[PDB]
Design a protein around this nucleic acid. Structure first.
Ligand SMILES: [K+]
Ligand SMILES: [Mg+2]
Ligand SMILES: [Mg+2]
Ligand SMILES: [Mg+2]
Ligand SMILES: [Mg+2]
Ligand SMILES: [Mg+2]
Ligand SMILES: [Mg+2]
Ligand SMILES: [Mg+2]
Ligand SMILES: [Mg+2]
Ligand SMILES: [Mg+2]
Ligand SMILES: [Mg+2]
Ligand SMILES: [Mg+2]
Ligand SMILES: [Mg+2]
Ligand SMILES: [Mg+2]
Ligand SMILES: [Zn+2]
Lengths: 127, 97, 63, 25, 212
RNA sequence: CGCGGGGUGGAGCAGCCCGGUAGCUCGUCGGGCUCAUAACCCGAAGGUCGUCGGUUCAAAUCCGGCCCCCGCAACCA
RNA sequence: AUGUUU
RNA sequence: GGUGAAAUUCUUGGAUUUAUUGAAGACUAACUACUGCGAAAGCAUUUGCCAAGGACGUUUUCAUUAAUCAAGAACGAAAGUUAGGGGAUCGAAGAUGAUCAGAUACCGUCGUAGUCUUAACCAUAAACUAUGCCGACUAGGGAUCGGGUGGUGUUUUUUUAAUGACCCACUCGGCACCUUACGAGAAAUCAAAGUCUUUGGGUUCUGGGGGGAGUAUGGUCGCAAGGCUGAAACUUAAAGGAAUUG
RNA sequence: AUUAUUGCUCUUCAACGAGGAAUUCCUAGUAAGCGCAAGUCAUCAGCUUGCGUUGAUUACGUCCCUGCCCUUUGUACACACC
């Protein structure tokens, strides 16, 4: 009764990407970022920016013709954070509320088996 | 003098424990010394469980939970208030609050 | 526009970042055997009647 | 002075002494 | 000024031959052209599907499946099984402190030509009357149990194709077999087949591939 | 000598490719928060588009010359 | 974010 | 992209982001604990091989064969050195961006040596439990690890019984832990830092106010960096330890 | 009495179309509007001190903002962070 895409929320610190693609993932649809919807150089990760980007992506999705999305959310992962950014929740807010249907919330944050010795040195960032 | 009865870590009979990196500042930490907190916060609460369940195409969806073990150096743990400076007698209290 | 009226029966406590809202135990008039936790900004005491548009949204603590 | 940096400065001084004594024969 | 979605066509993926349902969804791609055929741009696309969506029952919410398109028959993407892995949420809900995790792995070739790497997972459990609050193994029980799991896994595979392997993993009969074969060594509650991965593909062999 | 590019507030740029009409980043000035600067918020000053002619319902924008800077290419008084 | 000495 | 904010920088040669693969090196998450082994440094993916190890059990054997140990030897984190290989990430140096009054730092980006391995050095750490080893005794208690003993035990079945896991009772050895301390200490605290002016179980090492100084010199080891041994002149009334009040 | 002390009369009638970031006071006869008495005085109120008249709104709480108090904590400070 519906047609399935993939939400591909990439909510890092300093930015949140909303990337809705086909079920395969090779073909992209309306890849929108928070920096596209705010120009301050510090609010790209803000919940308002993420919400506006997700609303635009949902409008473009409902103009292409995709109705429901399996949601794959991730942080930077790798070696840096492992923690989803503040804007992912707002982006999913907008995706759910803009008429798109939501399915299979999933965390695809990349987690290593103690690889890629972390950036910052053994004494870390000294602020 | 000696501030803590054993040490500011948990190591008796080992000598060396392989190190870990602070999640917040990336400082190298002994694994037993690092403040370890398991975050089992749900993937999407966002005051939005109702919205997500309504937009869900899955009945009784039972949205999943994200697990993440955070390791802090004591400086970052104090600064972000995972741990707090306790009284001299209250330091001898290992039960969680 | 869905309509439903209820009444506060147990005042829970003061809540809010600035401490403006009050948590209230909401007893419905229709199908009364249900108590709902909700948030109200204005002054409230017991046996006061409230109007809520949404029917199922449990207001949790405001942090 | 940190004792570490005092030791490092002393080591540099000792290296200079070794160089000058190597020159002087 | 271009709107690349105006020249794209949709395809319905009739992915499984055996799970419960042929149809899993739709996918869009640019129209075939002179030096770039639509079937040529396809045949490599893989879809990521939920086993609960495949079987109709929510008791398969984890064990997501990869399926790669192998041929196009009139806007119908015929795939074949490509791999299964647990979700991160499920994996982190199974892994807990105050218990011993045991992971085992094999590399085995199925009956006809199919090469798979299999990852089995399990965790220790507490007894009904146990007072001790960790219930750890003695690591010799762990070595023996993982030997047994590898033996059972290599005995189940190499006599089954992907089709029969799916017909055994979906009812999780292998998990119960591991539980029954290791219940005399350690209780080992949380038996699962955490992952199956494709390593090498054989000749296309459409004759056996078209089983539906 | 030929073909192309460039000149826009005090400095750097979009605007031009088919007129609603000069702005953006930094510095400069004023007020605001702070115990005080910085970051920041709100205001204020700034050229009239390199210089001329021409075309144009009203041209920096398109056209034809000149001054400057640039790349390539050619040289029988 | 920074605010030097007596 | 990155930051508190920026900027260096990549970017209509399609950068960031998505998907399918491959190559490289490093590492072994989550399980991971007041838990284990090792003489220490250290040791955490599977399997095989290779030898070794402590505890336990013993109505087995030897019978003083033992304890600590100058000189003397083996190993010895990281960093560094030599010659090959490898070089992903991080990253002393170096180069750049911003703040600063200056910022040759903290913060951001790139990035050499190094980070990995083989064969040789190096022999140094807050190499710490800042607590030598062996032996005996002096409170109580509960967990935990490995082993052994018993149960009208619970659970697992194969078919009596039995190992497996579990509970209880111990017992030996171990990492520790909590209370109380006769006792000790200046106190913090300590089951050893107790059995010390009522001072002797055995034995090795180190120290004699703070600087100069772990320096100079001599010797010795090292390719080097340096390691070991190691003063004196001179100078000073305090330095220092614990705890208390502001 | 000029650099009008002040009072009064006539006469061109200027900005201001409700206010920017910010910022001050305040919980019931209170804020606000209003004038009166006194003080400063030979004279001069927009000032201040007291007063009365008209007299609301919202709240009956909180530690997010600021400041302060207490407790804990660190100190190599004790003339005590000048
Ligand atoms: K390198
Ligand atoms: Mg700091
Ligand atoms: Mg201290
Ligand atoms: Mg050590
Ligand atoms: Mg002074
Ligand atoms: Mg263990
Ligand atoms: Mg592992
Ligand atoms: Mg010796
Ligand atoms: Mg080394
Ligand atoms: Mg600084
Ligand atoms: Mg030493
Ligand atoms: Mg002395
Ligand atoms: Mg002291
Ligand atoms: Mg006055
Ligand atoms: Zn940290």
């Amino acid at each position: 009764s519906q047609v399935f895409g993939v939400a591909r929320i990439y909510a890092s610190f300093n930015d949140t990407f909303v990337h809705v693609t086909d079920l395969s993932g090779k073909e992209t649809i309306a890849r929108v970022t928070g920096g596209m919807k705010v120009k301050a150089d510090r609010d790209e990760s803000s919940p308002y920016a993420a919400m506006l980007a997700a609303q635009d992506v949902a409008a473009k999705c409902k103009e292409v013709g995709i109705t429901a999305v399996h949601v794959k959310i991730r942080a930077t992962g790798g070696t840096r954070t492992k923690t989803p950014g503040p804007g992912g929740q707002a982006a999913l807010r907008a995706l759910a509320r803009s008429g798109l249907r939501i399915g299979r919330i999933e965390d695809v944050t990349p987690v290593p088996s103690d690889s890629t010795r972390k950036k910052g040195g053994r004494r870390g960032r000294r602020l | 003098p000696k501030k803590r009865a054993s040490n500011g870590r948990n190591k008796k009979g080992r000598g060396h424990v392989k190190p870990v990196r602070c999640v917040n500042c990336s400082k190298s930490i002994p694994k037993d010394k690092a403040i370890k907190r398991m975050a089992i916060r749900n993937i999407v609460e966002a005051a939005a469980v109702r919205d997500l369940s309504e937009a869900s195409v899955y009945p009784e969806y039972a949205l999943p939970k994200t697990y993440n073990k955070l390791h802090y150096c004591v400086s970052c743990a104090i600064h972000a208030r995972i741990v707090r400076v306790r009284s001299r007698e209250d330091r001898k209290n290992r039960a969680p609050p | 526009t869905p309509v439903t009226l209820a009444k506060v029966i147990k005042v829970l406590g003061r809540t809010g970042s600035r401490g403006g809202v009050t948590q209230v135990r909401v007893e419905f008039l229709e199908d009364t055997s249900r108590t709902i936790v909700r948030n109200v900004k204005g002054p409230v005491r017991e046996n006061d009647i409230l109007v809520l548009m949404e029917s199922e949204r449990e207001a949790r603590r405001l942090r | 002075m940190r004792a570490k940096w005092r030791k490092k400065r002393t080591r540099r001084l000792k290296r200079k002494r070794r160089k000058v004594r190597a020159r002087s024969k | 000024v271009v709107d690349p979605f105006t020249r794209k066509e949709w395809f319905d993926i009739k992915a499984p031959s055996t799970f419960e349902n042929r149809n899993v969804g739709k996918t869009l791609v640019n129209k075939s052209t002179g030096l770039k055929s639509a079937s040529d741009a396809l045949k490599g696309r893989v879809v990521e599907v939920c086993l609960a969506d495949l079987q109709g029952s929510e008791d398969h919410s984890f064990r997501k499946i990869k399926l790669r398109v192998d041929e196009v028959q009139g806007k119908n993407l015929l795939t074949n099984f490509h791999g299964m892995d647990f979700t991160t949420d499920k994996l982190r809900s199974m892994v807990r402190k105050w218990q011993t995790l045991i992971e085992a792995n094999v590399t085995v070739k199925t009956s006809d030509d199919y090469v798979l790497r299999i990852f089995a997972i399990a965790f220790t459990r507490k007894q009904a009357n146990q007072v001790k609050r960790h219930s750890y193994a003695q690591s010799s029980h762990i070595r023996a149990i993982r030997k047994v799991i590898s033996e059972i896994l290599t005995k189940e595979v190499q006599g089954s194709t992907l089709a029969q392997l799916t017909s055994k993993l979906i009812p999780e009969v292998i998990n119960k077999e591991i539980e029954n074969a290791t219940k005399d060594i350690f209780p080992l509650q949380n038996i699962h087949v955490r992952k199956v991965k494709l390593l090498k593909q054989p000749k296309f062999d459409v004759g056996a591939l078209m089983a539906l």
